[PDB]
Amino acid sequence: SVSKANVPKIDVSPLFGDDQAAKMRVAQQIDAASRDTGFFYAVNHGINVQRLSQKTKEFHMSITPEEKWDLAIRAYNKEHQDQVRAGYYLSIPGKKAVESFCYLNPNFTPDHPRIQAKTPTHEVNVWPDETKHPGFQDFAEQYYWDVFGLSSALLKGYALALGKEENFFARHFKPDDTLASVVLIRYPYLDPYPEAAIKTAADGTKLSFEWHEDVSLITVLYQSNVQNLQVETAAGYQDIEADDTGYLINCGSYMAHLTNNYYKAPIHRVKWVNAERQSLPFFVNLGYDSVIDPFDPREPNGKSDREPLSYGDYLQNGLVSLINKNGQT
C-alpha cells in the first residue's frame, strides 16, 4: 500500500550568507533531493508564514460574491478579456470546490513596456477595494518580494548543485521582469462534499487535482497542515507529509528541459481531503525573453542537444496546456 515520500528538510539559511562551503553543503542536499523524489522542505527560510496563512484566510473568508465577479479572470467573466492569469478563480458550488486568487509581479503597471506592448503572460494585477480589505494588497505585494528573495537564494542552491556559478539561474530572475506568480488557493470543507468535484485516478485514489508536472523553473509552496500531495515514483505514488512551517520545493518542467532531465520535474497530484486548507504556491518564472542554454551534468563534456527555449513562450504554452489537460482551475 501507499508508501511515503522521502522529503528531506534542508536548512537553506546558508544560501543567504557568505560561507561558500556551507552553501555547497546545502547544494549537495538539494542535488540529492532533486535526484530522488524531486521534493524537499526548505527550512530556516526567514518568512513569516504564520502571517501569510492568517492574512490569506482573512481574505478568503471575507471576500463577497460580488467582489469575486469584479475580480474574476476571463474564464469566469467575459468582460475581463485582459485577465488571463491574474484575478479571482471562482468556485462552482456542487461542481468545483477550489477557488483562488492569483497575482503577478507588482512592477507590471501601465508604465511597464511589456504592458504597453500587450505581451502575452504580462498583466496588471487586480485588487479588491482597500477599505473593504484593509492591508491585503500591501501584505500580498510584500509577500511577493519576501518569497522572491527566498527563491533567489534557492536558485543559488540549485545552480551550485549543478556545478555552476551561483547566479546561473538567479541572474535571469529579476524584479523588473519576472513572470513569477503567487496563487492563494482555498480548498474548502464541505458537508456534503459533492462527488462532481472529486476525480477518481486510474489507481482508484480520489483526487482534487490530477497528475501533472509544474509549469515553472521551481515551485516554492506553503500549505496548511493537511496532508494532500502525492509524488509519482517508479514504485507508485507516495504521500508527501505536511509541514506548515516549511516551504515545499520542487522543480518545474523548464528545469527538466534545461538539465536534460537530470533534475526531473516530478509528477505529482492532489488527493481529495474533506478539510479546510490552504495551498499558496509561488511559481518561480523567469523573464519573457530569458533563455537558459541546456546542459547535461551526466556527460563528461556537459553537452546537451536540447534546444534552448525562450521562457515566455514556454510559459504561455505550458499554462494553456495545463488547463486543457487538467481543467480550468
Ligand SMILES: CC[C@H](NC(=O)[C@H](CS)NC(=O)CCC[C@H](N)C(=O)O)C(=O)O
Ligand atoms: C487548483 C489546484 C492546484 N493546482 C494548480 O495550481 C496547478 C498545478 S501546480 N497549477 C496551475 O493551475 C497553474 C496556475 C498558474 C497561475 N494562474 C499563473 O498564471 O502563473 C493545486 O495543486 O492545489
Ligand SMILES: [Fe+2]
Ligand atoms: Fe503542482
